[model samples]
Target: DFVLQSGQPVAIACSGSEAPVVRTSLDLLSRDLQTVLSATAHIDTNTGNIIVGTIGQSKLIEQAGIDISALKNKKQAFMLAVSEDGKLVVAGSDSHGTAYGILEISRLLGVSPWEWWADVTPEKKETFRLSGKFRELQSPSVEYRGIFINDEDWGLMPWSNKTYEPSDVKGEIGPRTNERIFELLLRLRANTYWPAMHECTLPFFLTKGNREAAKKYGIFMGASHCEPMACNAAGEWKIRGKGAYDYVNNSPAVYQFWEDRVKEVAGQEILYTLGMRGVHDGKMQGAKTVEEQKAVLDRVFVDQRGLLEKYVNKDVTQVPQVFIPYKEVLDIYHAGLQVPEDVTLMWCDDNYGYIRHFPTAEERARKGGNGVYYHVSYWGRPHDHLWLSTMSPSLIYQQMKQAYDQGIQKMWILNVGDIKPAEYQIELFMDMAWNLDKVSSEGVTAHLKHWLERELGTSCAKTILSVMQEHYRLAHIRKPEFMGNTREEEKNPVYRVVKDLPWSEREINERLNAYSELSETVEKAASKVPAGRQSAYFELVKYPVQAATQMNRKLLYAQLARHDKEDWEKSDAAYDSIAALTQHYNSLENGKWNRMMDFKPRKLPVFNRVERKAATAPMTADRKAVCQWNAAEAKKGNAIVCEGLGYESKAAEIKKGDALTFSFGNLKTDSVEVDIRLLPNHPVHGDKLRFTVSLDGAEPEVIAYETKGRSEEWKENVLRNQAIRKIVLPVTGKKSHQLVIKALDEGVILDQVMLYEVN
Candidate 1:
């Protein structure tokens, strides 16, 4: 057995013929070893016990007599085994795989991928050793796994330009910044990236050394849906094109613009975005209707492939390309735009976490396979949750895992805004992509616990995990970003007052007490963390919890201020605490993140201080839970409680042929309305998203909650984050009755079931 200890003589060997990422990964491994063991590890072409190399490129591995046949013909596959002659071997099918194999040591040594970004310093260990056997092989579940650096107007751009990178041009995401990003990606075992293309920041290609850095790190570049042919529509076309970006009227200039980029990056690793949209994110400017838009896209695809065939590859189908049918483009795709069979059809989520569409049987039969462009951060209507990263891990798991099970293994790209607060979620996403079994359907909290144990010691990880669990549970109810209780992008933006809150007095007090307990628990947990880890803990745990707690108190107390004028003082103080907390966050690490944490993003009216309004109506009597049960709490038979969802902080997950039974007692009337609520997640396979409900073993009534595409009902479901279905049933005024719920299709999420008696 190999026992690694502090100050051990560590040595590794690799050849120069391997990819630059392999060599770079060797340096990171060395650096991490030095940081953890307080000694420099040696690297040489030969004379090392730990040998690392790829199969075809490394003569060293070939000479060392290590067998790598297990990795052959597999994409991003690696093997870690101890050689028979006492030499340790790390081998891979390709460069990325080899790099991942080497970084696997870093993970074993307890170095987090967020070591630098989140200030997660590895703890000083006296000795480290592996248990049991050491021979294992791994391959990625998905072909392309990466993140999109989008919506940089807030955190990443300002911090890059002002603090971290400081380029001559103010808003350039220069090589230095991208170098760190790519390093983080490699450490996370990811390989693809879609660069930031917002008009506020410079496009990726415009900056020198950006492309070179990505190449060095083995990160394949791809474009957003609007940026066709690897071209940023806003950044590139607006700068160079002479005419309108109308494919019908000015076809030549548009084709020339696309050809320029495809020709420039011809042989490099890139997944070309096929098809056209507006110069920015709107519809195609030339097309007047759905049919016209379909025709324009058909012609555009023909021209796009012609350029690829002429410049990049003779057989254009051999080149990796994706057609993202996002937003309005989805309608045009549904209208029968003839996308080539070889081009990947990338589906998207509804800007929130719920996926809008999945691949059909025919779509899955294509050679290119299907993909998903999901979002954990967005900048659009229905109240942006951009301020904090409070999206439930369970929700992310439910959606992504369902997609994977239904054959979305081609690619997965998460829209990570700023990448700061979203650190844990980012790693979870990459982990699932790297290994489908890395996190099980019931292992999200376990994953977080292990992650915490690595960053902080075992002493505080459980408590921190508990605090974070509660944090996520509360955010699932209503995100701090949605605390404004306001709607954006509606015909008229309406600001909400205290009375607008749906909570009664008891519910308000319960929420306030929950946040209060979490805030105190975070402080106690902070004291337990080591001094060296305080900054990391603050960024990863303390700040998020305390910030969210105060935000909740700020809004909830404002609701109370309607009755008691003195409660306004408490509400005002809570707002002040958030400002002070944000100021302190800016002050950490010697002002390293001065402008990164914006307390109030977009300056929406929700962020404004509470203005007192006289109390008109007295508080409504608490909606008594006469007969209610969280579906997750009372589920049986093929149903599992999805943690951190629903009104009671957990949702019951039911698949086809699965049933959940809830019993209600003491009915006061013969007639009642079964107030059923379900998380409005879309179907994974068929068009029908439905479930069946039966009372007391009577005939089952099929209740389908599927709304039209982008209908008003759909809008409300996503905004409110739940779909309500009520069915009136008549009983014989019995003391007890059983309500049975069954999934008619897969991915039905049952939240709560209530029986409200009628007079």
Candidate 2:
């Protein structure tokens, strides 16, 4: 058994014949024995001996019987001890490890000696030597943080007239504009660039200039293309073509055009992807019949595949396309064609087209087969209509999950960056996309918070998030039937009883107010934060608020205009109010945010004539020719057909107060109706057509035409006044109104008979 040193200080000594042997022996003694003594005492080497110090004594090492010179420039080990007299001593061997023991002994003497010494050994202790070498270490708190490339290119001809002309390069701004836009995205750390429509005539990354710009920024490009013929007027595609894919006559040309363009721009370096192809609404002419439409669509699929192989140099397998069909359109197409597996059919269930009157998915599939891809066109909060108030996130999630359960692989959102509320719906869909089984509204809300904080700043994060959540909850509330009766809501005594909030008593208004408050709070807080941190948030909130406020102001003015229509003085005042309100809303602040929310109510344009050309009328019925009149500007030139009815036999001279009418006998009729067709050039030609019909001829009733065109289809080149009574018979016994025909201008021909009846 080892004898225990129970005092405050202890000591050790070593000696040998040679100096080297003595040092080596001392080092061994210090290394092995100091290891045991260090547990109880503070030890150090001084001159030729090892010194020990008291645990509480600061100068104990100097007071101990030790010299400092022997320890200098020598590898020596040491033993430490604290004496009962509160003294310390250290003894050492010839190694640095042993010298470390001397320092430990001194430290122990200077600190708590009894506590330091008590835990020296244990009954369970087995002498085991173990050693391991340690090196350096390092890492980062976060990895994978950056921006995603978003390509927005919906602006096209017809819808946007600015780009319609063949010579107009103004539309080029759309793709060229992306060059600057992608720079912004790169700054935000976005890595992927998705060019939405490659076939668009405008040069995108597929263009040389844009592709070079994209390369400089180090962006990975994804190109998406779709045949427009399968879609409808609103850009929703239909899979109801004859084959798996329907190609428009010009679509192949369009695809090849873009493929060649992209090849020139990026060569083989760019990664290319294709989208679904079917019957897109490209120049189908809005055919109402099924047979006529299917014939045109059948050619679409065969032609499309042929074109894809020709230009892509790879089979359709290399490039996968998402085939989306408006369900009804799908049914009609399937009626004549077989649905194929190679095509991933995307069924667009637009909520019964409640927003716009399209067919339902179930109805569509009943006619065709189960679609491979199920797409929900979730357009939030319908504007200009009250049909879609019931389309909520809960409904969307339920439907989307149902599709997912049925094995749908991919999901695409229609319009992503349109508005705040819509963005919330899209985020919910994205969450569902990742984990369909574990999705819930709460999970959606949580994910939304993270997304908002990443995109918009913290100040806006909570407010916008809450607003969207609340909207999702209350989106199905009862929609108001009446938009609001300004005159009645303003003046009725009953309206006054509930006029505290005017016409905003509906649940939609409540939702609107809640969202508005959230928006206001976000804007207020954002204003307080530093510009660099909250610039995006400021812009997002500012435009929406300004738009809403300005829209409201316009509505107020419109209400006043309606109510005070009889009072020109008050009307002028109302107009002035509207103008000022519009100006206030349109004015830019600090020039940093330059967008305006000005609403100019639609106004009808006044028509003026330029010229009219007249050709001679044919006399012989066998020869079959008639007078022709052409105006430079005919309002209904495309639809209206003006042919001569045989001359009126009885009442030939048509007068101002006489009944002026026309008729067709034993002739083919498309449809019989009336329309106000104005030829603007008629005014310049000093040519105006007027008519009056009299039954008994007390002064014949003059029908007042409002000069405004009707919104529906065009009928005959005349608008009949339903209020006017029919002209009665003359003494000749045939019922007629005296007719007179006159052309104020020299070159104006009255083709159709001024007065005639079908008999």
Candidate 3:
């Protein structure tokens, strides 16, 4: 083991020809060392004990007699070892690998990847050391891993324009903001970026420092599906071009619009988004029917490739390009649109958690592999979940792991709204992309415990983990953001009426008490955290938990107010609590986060005054005709109950080829409907999500619960938080029977099962 003292003179040696990005990273390493050990690190060739450079780029590494040939023929691969002279050697196959090796030291010194973004400050130490186990080699599982900056109106845009990077122009996300974002991405070991393309902000290329910042950080710039060929049509079309963005009639102008950007940013690291869509995330115009749209898309791809060949590279296939079949485009691709074999096919999620589709066996064999653009935050839907980051980590692990196992390893980009509260999920996403084995199917909670330990310390990590587990569990049933029970962007959105909740009084109080307990637990634990870390604790734990708790009370108490006028004050106080918490969040760090936390985002009605429109008793299960069984209480199987899911404590994840059997008493009637409730998960294995249900020693009947993208069935499943499938079975003179459920796929989650007799 080697030790670093507080006042040690640390010398670092590197090749003069190293990339500028690597040099910048080395500067950061110096700063990190200063933060932790209060040591001074400098470049000293003569007495340098640490050598950092690409394997073949530096002759000094060879002179030190350290072998780094294992990194040959590898992309972004690195090795760290001790040489014969007791010098530390950090070598990489490429520039990025070397940069990551330097940053890995920062992580080892207790610096979080979110040190800057989430205010996760590093603890001061008098000294630090590494054991013999420090020697290692590392590489990413996915080729490209990154994030997309989206829905910035509430947080990022305002924060950048008015507070952080203020300038003459308002709502500008210029170079200063991009630089910080790029630095965060690098520390997370990510390489790609999808710039924000909102009408509220200026175009990325038009912004003076944005492009340069991306280049300096060694980040690969890519556009979203709507901004094809890297054109920011929402903000650029009016200023830079004329005529409609239709490729049919205005072909020359549209073609030139794409060509200009291609020429301007030529030869830089970019994954060009290929294909034509209407400007700024709308459907492609100039094509009324699917046939016409397909033909126009085909023509557009050909012309776009032609421009790339003429300007960027003579060999079009050598250029990195991706065609994202998202939303309407997915329909066109399903209708048999031809995509070139060399261009990567980027699939998209349903804008919630479920992926719309995975690459088929044939598509997986293409020269360019598959990629996925998933969302942890969204704007328009049955409802928007823009306020809180309450997505289940287990769900993320299950979906992304299956995507990787199925050969979707080329790229992975997550849509993180403001990057504040969503810190854990974003880190989890990038970590999985870097190493799929970092978290197991059941290790999601365990991962969070380690994260908390790193951020706050072990004193309250498990308690924090326990409360957070309950937080996610309640949100999985209904998110704080969706508590308003209102829809947006439809033909006509109907606001929710003030009425009593459908949950039983028992169920309602349980949910209310569940969130209340979580908030109290977090509040009590806040004192245990170091005074210096109180801000981090607030951002990471206190605010989100308290805020989510108040939102639930505001809505649920409002529902109670419909029946009892006395409950009005309670509901009103809950609403006020949410407002105060949001105000405190904005006031943190001397208003560094002002305008970043919107109390009522999008002005949804759920945040407004409540008036009684209907009164009814709470809904309860029928004890006379219905027999219910929680999935966690299954009689037998290899299935494990996944916590933070279902109505109560757990949801059973019946592993593939395993059967979960439940013994039932004598039937009340000859005919009954077997109702099964499951989480609306996408197919993790094959084309279908399926399971088998059978009655005592009888033939098993196959049941497929897969729903197509945005179908009514799927919409109901996601909104209701469970997919209920009722199957009627006719039995003659039955005594007692064992009901069996067999998993035909890997991730078929079971919530609850019920049986009701029919006349």
Candidate 4:
């Protein structure tokens, strides 16, 4: 490792012209180094010992002669290496690439990006030397991997307005908020961001300052998937009249409204989302046949590209554009409609993190390839999953890695609900995206250790890693309340009505007991995280673990209350701590830190309107019928027995001798078909789920599902739903019969096997 010593005066330089960001990066380097070594840092064009610059400007970097031709396809790639002569060299392809190099080198010197945000002061090493051979040439795994600032009306809006109190941020996100957001992005080495698009947020471009702010901060702005062609959800709504959103009919006013938004920030660094839907996420309306929808969408794209040229640039291809095939429009693609080969066809993840469709070989061969739009939290649906983080770091790795292998590597955008309290998951995901090979290959434990070492110093990594592993272990079993066990449940309106968490009371209690016990044991060891770094550990590892533990026990307590009087009394006591934890989530420090859940400022405490509504709301224990399903909870014999279900976990994957049996007693059936759920969207992709059903002692009937190479999404029905196969029962409707499922295919995610009876 190259050593940076006490008397070594660090110098900074960069390529000149449109390189203000390069210069900006140099200034940060000088400032951070000065703080670290208590030594002088400044620019000396030809005489400085160390050199930092982009291509073509610095002689020192040029002489070092590190060929960067391999970084051709990767735009945001960089290298920071020691020259043979011992002078430090940092080079990059683009502005932020160089900036990333600077931050990377700073990290080697023990400086954290959170040094300012979380009061994490880096060590002041006067005689600090690099520990090992230091050379890294880095590039992104997913180019546009970043957070989408959505659902900001709750805690973010109130906290930003009341706490920070910035000028020019009345109805929309303010300058200070944007500043913080962009700073976080740069630190994370992520390059993309989608500004607030919900109805409650004001138009992002309404304030001209943030337009410059985003560029000034090195952030590439993007519109949401629904916004279509450079227009955001709320952008055109305020400018145009109702029913003026009819793009299928070629509404000139909506086109004009959208053109205005695209022109507003013409030359800015941004990606244009192309296509048309109603204002603020409208459902399918108007006659939309395979041919009709295709013609309309074709016309829409042609005009939208024209608008990009008329407003932003003479050549529309210079401006990056993506067409989101979401909801009904997915049907447009399935109908063999034509999309321009130049534009990116961004496939969505069923809004619950399941990749509904991957790019086919024909689709992947396009110039733009494909992009993924996945979610960590969602607002619409059966219910909003905003309370706790339900995303498993491992699940994200598996899905994205598969997509990447399928050439789905153009973009990756995550819907970070509230954008707080979801730190562990967010950090893991972003790290993986930044370097998929290194992180995923290294595994989750290694990733946790890296983060712990970065944020809280080496002293706290192991204990905190243990603490967080327990937190994720619990969240893996159960997502937060109301968000069910599976995405199939969260998106399926009908399924949500009848679904019970596939875990039995005995199953739920044992898992919760184990999770809490493991958490307690880990946290006890983590309690010794040095007082100076304890709060940092608390916010990073402690907060999430405590939240999961308290909530997990609360779920168990409420479930037990239905049957046992003693457990019901215990439920009341458990709820008191639950309220305190919720309050602690919203507690303030340093005019910041009120970063989760509901808000109840100094004037009011306990719970806000959101939590107060939750307070009197009936507990799950009130529903005695919940534990009475033929879910995985009661499956005795199973080939592949996977534990847990709902927002946190997937259903059982049963194969050949791996049969599932459900018992029925004294029940008369009107609809006796088994609602077998399989991911049909994953049809041509994976081994399609197939099975055979036998009722009682009747002859086994082969029950299978096929997607004809492709399937059309009819809301939850066709998009991603239960592939219901009829159970040919020999017994009469009034009599009892046992149903046994024999798996026929290699891949089957049997979410729920329903047996509806006549009343």
| Count of clashes, each model | 0, 71, 0, 10
Off by over 4 Å in 2: 1-168, 174-176, 179-288, 349-399, 411-413, 417-442, 452-465, 468-531, 549-759
Task: Write one digit per residue (lDDT tens) for candidate 4, span 642-695.
Answer: 332322335556655577777776654444545555533344254354677777
Residue range 1-759, candidate 3, lDDT tens digits: 456788677989987788877887888889899988888898965457778888778877678777788898899978888775667778988999999989888888888987777778888888776654468889999999999988888888888888889867755888998988998998999999998888988888988988988888989999898888888888888888879889999999988888889998987888899888887776788998889999998999999999899998999889999999998898899899999999999999888788878888988999889999999998876677788898888678767887898899999999998777798899999989988886664377778888888888689786798887888778888888767566666566454443443565567787889888898899889889976687889888988899999988888887766656346778788888888998898898898788888877667776675654546664443244366787756677766766445666567788888888877777776687899999888886576888899887679999999887677787667766788888988766567777899998877889888887785
| Displacement of the residue 581 alpha carbon in candidate 2, Å | 11
Angstrom error at residue 418, model 4: 2.5
Write candidate 1's Cα lDDT for 40-118 as tens digits.
Answer: 7788887777889888888777776666798987788788876665666889898889999999988888888988988
lDDT of every model, 2 decimals: 0.83, 0.32, 0.83, 0.63
TM-score of each: 0.96, 0.39, 0.95, 0.79
The collision pairs in model 1 are: none
> Is 2 or 3 the stronger prediction by TM-score?
3
**Superposition TM-score, candidate 2 onto the true structure:** 0.39
Query: RMSD in Å for candidate 3, one decimal?
Result: 2.3
Task: State how far residue 593 of model 4 sits from its true place (Å).
Answer: 1.9
Tens digits of lDDT, candidate 2, 1-759: 113243223344322221332233234333333354442222234322243322222243445534433444332233344433333344333322233343343223221111111111111112311112211111111111112111222222211213222235433434344444443332222233444332233434323355655554444444322333212212212211232232334454444443444345332223332233333233244344667566655555555555455655465555333344453455454565543335444444432111111223433343222322222222121111111122345445544544544434333323222112133344455446533554543444455576555455566565666654443333232111112211121233442121111332243344446545754665576654434334334333443343333333233333333333222343244335445534543343332212222222111010101011221332112222111122212221221111111111011122233223332232222221222222111111122334433332334434332121211111111111011112322322333322222222221222222122222
Model 1 CA RMSD to the hidden true structure, in angstroms: 2.1
Task: Score residue 230 of candidate 2 by CA lDDT.
Answer: 16
